[PDB]
Amino acid sequence: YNDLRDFLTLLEQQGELKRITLPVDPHLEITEIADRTLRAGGPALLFENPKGYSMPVLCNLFGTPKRVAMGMGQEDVSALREVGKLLAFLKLNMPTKRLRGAPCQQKIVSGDDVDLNRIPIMTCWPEDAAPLITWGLTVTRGPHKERQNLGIYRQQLIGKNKLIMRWLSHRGGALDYQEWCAAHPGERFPVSVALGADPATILGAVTPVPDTLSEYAFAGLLRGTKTEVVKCISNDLEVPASAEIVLEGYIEQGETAPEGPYGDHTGYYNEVDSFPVFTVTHITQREDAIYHSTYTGRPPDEPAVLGVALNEVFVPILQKQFPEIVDFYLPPEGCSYRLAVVTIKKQYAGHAKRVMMGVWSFLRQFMYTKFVIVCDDDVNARDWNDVIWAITTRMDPARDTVLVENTPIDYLDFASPVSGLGSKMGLDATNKWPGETQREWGRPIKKDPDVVAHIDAIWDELAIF
Amino acid sequence: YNDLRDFLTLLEQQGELKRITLPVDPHLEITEIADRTLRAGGPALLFENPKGYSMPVLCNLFGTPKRVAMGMGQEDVSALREVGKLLAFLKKQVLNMPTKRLRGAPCQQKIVSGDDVDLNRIPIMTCWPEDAAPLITWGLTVTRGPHKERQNLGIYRQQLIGKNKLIMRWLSHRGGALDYQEWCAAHPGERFPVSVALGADPATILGAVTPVPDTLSEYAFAGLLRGTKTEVVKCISNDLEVPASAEIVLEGYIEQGETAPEGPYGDHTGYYNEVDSFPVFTVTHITQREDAIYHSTYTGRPPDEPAVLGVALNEVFVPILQKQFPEIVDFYLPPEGCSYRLAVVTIKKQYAGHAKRVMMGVWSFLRQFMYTKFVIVCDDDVNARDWNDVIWAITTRMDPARDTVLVENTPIDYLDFASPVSGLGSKMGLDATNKWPGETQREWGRPIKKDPDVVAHIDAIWDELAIFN
Ligand SMILES: Cc1cc2c3c(c1C)C(C)(C)C[C@@H](S(=O)(=O)O)N3c1c([nH]c(=O)[nH]c1=O)N2C[C@H](O)[C@H](O)[C@H](O)COP(=O)(O)O
Ligand SMILES: Cc1cc2c3c(c1C)C(C)(C)C[C@@H](S(=O)(=O)O)N3c1c([nH]c(=O)[nH]c1=O)N2C[C@H](O)[C@H](O)[C@H](O)COP(=O)(O)O
Ligand SMILES: [Mn+2]
Ligand SMILES: [Mn+2]
Ligand code: NA
Ligand code: NA
Numbered sequence: 041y042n043d044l045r046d047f048l049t050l051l052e053q054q055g056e057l058k059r060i061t062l063p064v065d066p067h068l069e070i071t072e073i074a075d076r077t078l079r080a081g082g083p084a085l086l087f088e089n090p091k092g093y094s095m096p097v098l099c100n101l102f103g104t105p106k107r108v109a110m111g112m113g114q115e116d117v118s119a120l121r122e123v124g125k126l127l128a129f130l131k132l133n134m135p136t137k138r139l140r141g142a143p144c145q146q147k148i149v150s151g152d153d154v155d156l157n158r159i160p161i162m163t164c165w166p167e168d169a170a171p172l173i174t175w176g177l178t179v180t181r182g183p184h185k186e187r188q189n190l191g192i193y194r195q196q197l198i199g200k201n202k203l204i205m206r207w208l209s210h211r212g213g214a215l216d217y218q219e220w221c222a223a224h225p226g227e228r229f230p231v232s233v234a235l236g237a238d239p240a241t242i243l244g245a246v247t248p249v250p251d252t253l254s255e256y257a258f259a260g261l262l263r264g265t266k267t268e269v270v271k272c273i274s275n276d277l278e279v280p281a282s283a284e285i286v287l288e289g290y291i292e293q294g295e296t297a298p299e300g301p302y303g304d305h306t307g308y309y310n311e312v313d314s315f316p317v318f319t320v321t322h323i324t325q326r327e328d329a330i331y332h333s334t335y336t337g338r339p340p341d342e343p344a345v346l347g348v349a350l351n352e353v354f355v356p357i358l359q360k361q362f363p364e365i366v367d368f369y370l371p372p373e374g375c376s377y378r379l380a381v382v383t384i385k386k387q388y389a390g391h392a393k394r395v396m397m398g399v400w401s402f403l404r405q406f407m408y409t410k411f412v413i414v415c416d417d418d419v420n421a422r423d424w425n426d427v428i429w430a431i432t433t434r435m436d437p438a439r440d441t442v443l444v445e446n447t448p449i450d451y452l453d454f455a456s457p458v459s460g461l462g463s464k465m466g467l468d469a470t471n472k473w474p475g476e477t478q479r480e481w482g483r484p485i486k487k488d489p490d491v492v493a494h495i496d497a498i499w500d501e502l503a504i505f
Numbered sequence: 506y507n508d509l510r511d512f513l514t515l516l517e518q519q520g521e522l523k524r525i526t527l528p529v530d531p532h533l534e535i536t537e538i539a540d541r542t543l544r545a546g547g548p549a550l551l552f553e554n555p556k557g558y559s560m561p562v563l564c565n566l567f568g569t570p571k572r573v574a575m576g577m578g579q580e581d582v583s584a585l586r587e588v589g590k591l592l593a594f595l596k597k598q599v600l601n602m603p604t605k606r607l608r609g610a611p612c613q614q615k616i617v618s619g620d621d622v623d624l625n626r627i628p629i630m631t632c633w634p635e636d637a638a639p640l641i642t643w644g645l646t647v648t649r650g651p652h653k654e655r656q657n658l659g660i661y662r663q664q665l666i667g668k669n670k671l672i673m674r675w676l677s678h679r680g681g682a683l684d685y686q687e688w689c690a691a692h693p694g695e696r697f698p699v700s701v702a703l704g705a706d707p708a709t710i711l712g713a714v715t716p717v718p719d720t721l722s723e724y725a726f727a728g729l730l731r732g733t734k735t736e737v738v739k740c741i742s743n744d745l746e747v748p749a750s751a752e753i754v755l756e757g758y759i760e761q762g763e764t765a766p767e768g769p770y771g772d773h774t775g776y777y778n779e780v781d782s783f784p785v786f787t788v789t790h791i792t793q794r795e796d797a798i799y800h801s802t803y804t805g806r807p808p809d810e811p812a813v814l815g816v817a818l819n820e821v822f823v824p825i826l827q828k829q830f831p832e833i834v835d836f837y838l839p840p841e842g843c844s845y846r847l848a849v850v851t852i853k854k855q856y857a858g859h860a861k862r863v864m865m866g867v868w869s870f871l872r873q874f875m876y877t878k879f880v881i882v883c884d885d886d887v888n889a890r891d892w893n894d895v896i897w898a899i900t901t902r903m904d905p906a907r908d909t910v911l912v913e914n915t916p917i918d919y920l921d922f923a924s925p926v927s928g929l930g931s932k933m934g935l936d937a938t939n940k941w942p943g944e945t946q947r948e949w950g951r952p953i954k955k956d957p958d959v960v961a962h963i964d965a966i967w968d969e970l971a972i973f974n
Contacts (some may be wrong), residue, residue, distance in 0.1 A: 043925035058972055068959045073970065077964070082972050132748050166956045243515045301951075306901055308950030338897065373893045378900040410905060424892045425544070425841040429775055429806060432846040434925050437878060439912045445906050455940070455946045456904050466907035472923070479922045482776030485805050488533055488634045502538065504523050504547050 043143075043282030044236050044330075047111065051084055056107060058083045065091045066160045066171070068495045070099060071335045078103040078342060084329070091162035091469030098236070098332045103342050108349040113238035117368055124446075126261060130253060131357075134260045136188075142270035142281035143326045144234075150274075150322045161197055164335040165303040169312075172199045175332045176287070177234040177245050178205070179277045182216035183223040188277065189213060190245035190254035190255035193300070195233070195318065196299050204299045205231070205291065205318040212251055214379060217316065221293055226272070228290040231318060236284030236332040241267055246346060247353065248405055253429035261411060274322055284329045288322040306375045310452060344372040354403065362398055363389070369421040370409075372421040379411040381421040389475045396442060396466035408450050412466045418484060430469040431484070440468040508611075508750030509704050509800070512576065513563070516549055521572060523548045530556045531628045531639070535564060543810060551798070558628040563704070563800045568810050574706035577730045577767040585820035588729070593825055595718070595814040602728045604656075606889035610738035610749035611794045612702070618790045619743075628752070629665055631804035633771040637780075639665045640770060643800045644701040645756070646673070646714050647745045650684035651691040656746065657681055658723035663701070663786065664767055672767045673699070673759065673786040680719055685784065689761055696758040698743035699786060704752030704800040709735055714814060715821070723783040726812045738881060742790050752797045756790040763787075774843050775806035778920075812840030822873055830866055832859070837889040838877070846921075847879040849889040857943045864910060864934035876918050880934045886952065898937040901950070909935065910934040 042050075051057035064070055064087050074085055084107060087097040102108045105117045112123065149155075154441055161171035173195040180189050189212030195203040207214040213231075220229045234241075244259030244267075256267045256278075269278035272288045279286050295317040301309040322365025334342045351370050359365050364384045371379055380399055384391065392414040399406050415434075419426040435441070442465070449462035471481055507515075516522035529535055529552050544563055549572060552562040567573050572597075574582050591597065629639035643661040648657050657680030663671040675682040681699075688697045702709075712727030712735075724735045725744075737746035740756045747754050763785040769777040769879060802810045816838065821835050830851045838845055848867055852859065860882040867874050883902075887894040903909070910933065917930035924930025939949060 060970060060972075062966060062970060069958055069963065072955070072959050072963045076967075077972055080973075081687075085972075086829075165953050166959075167951075167953075302952040306950070307897060308901065308952050310594060311948060329936075339893075358733070371896060372894040374900045375897070379896065407791075410903075411900065423807060426806075428839060428841045428847060429843070432842045432878065433774055433776070433921075434923055435878075436930050438913050438931035439925060441909075441911070441933065443906045443909070454950050455902055455945075457907060457945065457947075459947070462904050463906035466908065477923075477925065479925075479927070482922050483635075484776050485635075485771040486632050489536070491533045491537050495534065495541070499541075502525060502527055503544055504550075505537075505545070 041265065043238050044284065044332075045282075047239050048084075048086070050110070051107065056083050056104075057086060059086045059088055061088050063089050063091045066093070066097060066162045066333075068163060068166065070097060070162055070333075071164045071337075074103075074335065075337070075341070076102045078340065078345070086106070090160045093158070095158075095160055095329055095331050097160050097162070098330050099162075099334050100342060101332065101334075101400070102346050105345060105349050108346060111243055113206075113240070114266070117349060117352060120352035121356050123198050123262065124353040126259075127247070127249070127353060128357050128360060131250065133257045134255060134266055136254075136269040137266040137280055138278060139268055139270050144279065144281060144283040144286050145270065145273065145324045146321065146327050147326045147329075148273070154320050154323055156197055156200060156203070156320065156323075160331050160333075162333045162335065165309075165337065168302050169196060169300050169311060173197070173203065173233075173235075174334045174336070175242075176208070176235055177212050177232065177237055177242065177280075179232045179279055180213045180216040181277060182219045184219060185252075187252065188254045188256060189216060189251070190241070192245055194302070196297075196302070198297055198317070201288075201289075201320045203318045203320065204297050204315050206289075206299055206315045216252070217291060226293055228292060230277060230288075230290050232272050232275065232277045232279050232289070233287040233318075234279040234283040234428065235286070236281035236330055238263075238282050241280050247350060271322065272322075272346060284332065285319050285323065285325040285328075288324070289318055289320040291316050291318055301336050302451070305336040305339065305341065305343055306452075308454075339375060340372045344376045347376040348372055351380050354405070358402070361402055366393065366417045367421045368399075374411070379408060379413070379494075380406065380409050381413045381415065381427055383415045383417050383419050383421050384470070385417050386473075389473045392468040392470045393442060393466070396468075400447075400464065403451050407448055408453075410449070410464050412464075413469055414466065415469050416471055418486065427469075431467060434471055435467060435468045440472075442466040442468065506634070506733065508706050509752065509798070510750075511594075511709050513549075513551065513618060515575065516572065521548045521569075521575075523550055525550060525552045526554055527542040527882075528554045528556045531558070531562060531630045533631060533634065535562060535630055535801075536632045536805075539565045539803065540805070540809070543808065543813070555628045558626070560626075561798050562628050562630070563798050563812060564630075564802050566707075566740065566800065566802070567814050570813065570817055573711070573814060576711055576730050578708075578732070582817050582820050584730075584803070585818060586824045588726075589821040589824045590726075590805050591729075592717065592821070600721070600729065601727060601735060602725050604722075604724050604737040604746055604928040605734040605744060607736060607749050612747065612749060612751040612754050613738065613741065613792045614795050615797075616741065616792045617789065622788050622791055624665055624671070624788065624791075628799050628801075630801045630803065633777075633805060635665060635777060636770050637768050641665070641671065641701075642802045642804070643701075643710075644703055645705055645710065645748070646675070646681050647700045647702065647747055648681045648684040648883055649745060650687045652687060653720075655720065656722045656724060657684060658709070660713055662770070663934065664765075664770070666765055666785070669757075669788045671788065672765050673757075673875050674781050674783045683719065685759060689916060694761055696760060698745060698758050700740045700743065700745045700757075701755040701786075702751040703749040703754070704798055705748035706731075706750050709748050715818065740790075741792065749756060751794075752800065753791065753793040755788050756792070758788055759784045759786055771805050773804045773807060773809065773811055774920075788839050807843060808840035815844045816840055822871065826870065829870055830863060833863065834885045835889045836867075842879070845874070845877060847881070848874065848877050849881045849895055851883050851885050851887050851889050853885050854941075856937050857941045860936040860938045861934070868912075868915070868932060875916060878917070878930070878932050880932075881937055883937045884939055895937075902937045902939055903935060908936040908940075910936065
């Protein structure tokens with residue numbers, strides 16, 4: 041049973057983890073280093089000497105697709121499709137295995153001794169409001185079901201023992217709190233946050249499994265074995281046994297604070313807004329604890345790399361429903377969800393429009409996708425050279441562009457004319473069939489597969505690079 | 506005075522030229538290798554062991570902007586801006602700078618003529634599986650018309666149809682084609698002399714493809730790029746001059762009325778174009794260097810080498826756009842948009858609705874961009890040449906219905922089969938600039954700027970951090 045430390049050791053053995061011994065400030069400096077590293081496809085980073093703290097800081101953990109795959113016990117990135125086929129069936133789901141004691145409760149501090157300032161929480165960007173916890177697995181139960189939800193919600197530092205809990209309103213945690221409030225007026229909402237759990241639990245948390253299902257159960261499937269957990273000290277929630285740090289506490293009903301501004305995955309600052317305050321009553325950690333952090337900003341960043349790997353998970357679920365779809369890609373440059381390229385084997389006139397509507401309606405994660413480009417299967421959706429080629433040789437813009445007004449949009453997307461409402465554009469860049477055009481359509485250049493394969497065979501020997 | 510070999514030596518010194526010793530077929534295989542190489546921004550390629558031939562094959566010469574620049578003796582591409590300014594003034598008497606003619610030249614070391622002419626000995630490439638025949642793609646065709654002395658150079662694709670016969674595919678507005686057409690009117694039934702040089706010095710090659718007016722010899726323009734007169738030699742069987750350092754020269758003529766079906770061939774649009782008739786070039790002489798090298802390329806689904814060339818040569822028009830629209834910081838036509846069909850323009854926006862004026866400017870100001878179907882306008886914090894910035898801008902600064910402009914019934918290239926009617930179609934502009942008050946009622950996002958002190962500090966310890974190692 042591999043905890044996070046075992047994963048770091050595996051990475052180090054493979055030249056995928058660098059230990060930095062120079063002094064580096066968690067205030068801005070770590071982010072700059074991680075950003076350059078991620079942008080060059082470099083390793084994960086363990087800062088052994090954060091200025092002013094004793095606890096090392098781990099970041100860029102999932103900065104490459106490879107390391108995301110490795111984190112689910114797979115060799116490489118195309119095994120994620122198989123995990124998609126699995127995620128299909130969940131639309132006896134294995135419980136947690138509760139241990140009696142756990143490394144994450146080796147050192148405990150509570151009440152007045154709680155001081156989040158001892159932790160090397162990072163400040164990512166110059167106009168961010170305060171240090172920000174970015175890799176916390178927040179654990180919650182609602183009043184109506186037993187399911188334990190895990191989500192990653194950014195958490196601003198506002199005191200020795202107070203964090204702001206920034207869950208957006210459709211999240212498991214947020215819905216649990218909302219229901220708790222209705223069902224138990226004025227009663228404190230217990231919550232716990234785990235930092236540095238095992239990679240399967242972390243990845244399970246971020247995968248959009250249905251609200252009905254504990255993210256712990258999914259992590260179990262990725263791992264091959266039940267998720268090892270421990271009961272929290274001050275509530276009935278369970279956290280991963282191997283976690284490096286655990287924060288336990290509650291939300292006082294009605295207590296809120298102005299959150300931000302903070303730089304986002306879109307590359308802009310979010311403006312101030314109100315979210316609940318999480319009061320921390322306990323902090324439990326391992327001996328020699330490691331603090332796991334990250335940053336979001338202009339893409340690409342670690343979340344976006346995560347999000348490309350998790351798109352591979354969705355391809356099979358889309359293909360079950362639309363078997364005409366050969367590939368489906370959300371470029372990290374499009375802020376991970378705002379633009380999709382879809383390639384199909386077109387079977388009839390107007391086919392592309394059915395596929396656009398399918399992307400905009402079938403799965404909720406794509407409901408806010410503003411641009412959808414549809415192409416034939418002779419295009420590689422992951423290469424702008426092919427996609428722009430297809431756009432500029434197979435479209436008449438007015439004929440082949442679909443615009444739909446007054447559709448749901450992310451309320452933080454400031455480019456829509458009104459908060460929560462905007463338009464969508466689909467580009468039909470498929471070959472046009474009789475009926476769709478009265479011209480003689482061009483015959484595209486296809487490569488000889490025998491020549492392709494032969495050159496694959498001698499590629500390394502040719503040694504051009 | 507640098508010939509082509511001197512250039513290949515310079516490139517090799519700088520890690521910009523790879524010699525391939527493995528056997529590779531000019532039928533399809535070279536193209537595959539060159540295509541992968543170009544798509545990865547790799548070096549130029551010299552195939553020393555082409556299957557079935559002894560003459561090495563050079564391609565991907567200009568597969569990178571850098572190598573285009575190096576080909577004109579520069580670090581970077583912006584000397585082409587100065588040419589743009591020059592060509593503007595005319596609509597400088599020592600731009601009538603002639604050729605320097607040698608008597609005897611390396612390109613006439615070995616000579617074959619009449620029945621000994623056999624183009625099949627040359628490793629002419631076949632680029633794509635349904636191409637009709639091997640195709641000569643980097644020939645500088647040289648012609649004179651009957652009325653002026655000016656020698657035109659153009660690159661016209663040339664299909665192999667016999668031991669000594671090529672098809673000459675000049676489109677009808679080309680210098681060569683106009684010369685032939687005039688020759689026909691002025692001398693009915695007389696043979697039209699023509700010559701084709703392969704592997705001239707880079708300035709001559711680049712000069713051939715610069716769009717200079719029909720009134721001027723492309724040799725004069727190569728002279729300006731080089732800093733010195735172009736070295737040439739008289740052909741053996743006619744009065745045309747070819748570059749002295751050329752690796753191979755084909756001399757001959759066009760018999761009036763002799764034509765052949767040309768193609769189909771894959772073109773820069775990525776499609777096959779259909780068969781059509783063009784004149785036949787009869788080859789009476791082939792002259793070459795000792796140890797001659799054959800210079801080739803391919804065109805296809807972009808990007809390809811011609812498209813990278815075409816990007817570098819668009820720098821010739823940027824200053825003319827900027828004289829008129831000084832708000833324009835950059836103006837880029839991606840190769841992967843068939844070189845002219847998509848433009849990315851970055852501006853310093855000065856008022857609400859500015860992007861629309863710029864779109865209309867692109868679609869109206871010069872004939873070079875009138876047929877551009879898509880135009881994306883962005884702010885100057887975007888690098889127009891990086892799809893990571895441009896997509897970021899599109900997806901964070903647009904509402905599609907508000908910010909997309911469509912105009913119907915506008916002029917479109919007759920060969921573009923995607924428009925509903927030949928010659929007529931629509932255009933789209935994407936206004937991906939930051940929206941000002943009036944354009945939006947929302948509080949627009951403040952972009953994330955880095956702390957320059959932190960950036961500089963990390964620059965200072967970067968090597969010591971040793972992240973790579
Ligand atoms: C991996 C990750 C994810 C998330 C986040 C972050 C990371 C690293 C951080 C904290 C760095 C950045 C923000 S941000 O991308 O919104 O700017 N963050 C985040 C947020 N979801 C959310 O509601 N608030 C958040 O604050 N998300 C997404 C969220 O955690 C994810 O959608 C979960 O699957 C939601 O789980 P459920 O609530 O559906 O169970
Ligand atoms: C650089 C280059 C250029 C050209 C070409 C090719 C290359 C490599 C090849 C041979 C690869 C392929 C075709 S293609 O781009 O049309 O697909 N070729 C070409 C053709 N111009 C032309 O009339 N026929 C041609 O066959 N062009 C364009 C032409 O040479 C260019 O427009 C010149 O500036 C014309 O000079 P003028 O006749 O105006 O003096
Ligand atoms: Mn959930
Ligand atoms: Mn000319
Ligand atoms: Na979750
Ligand atoms: Na020319």
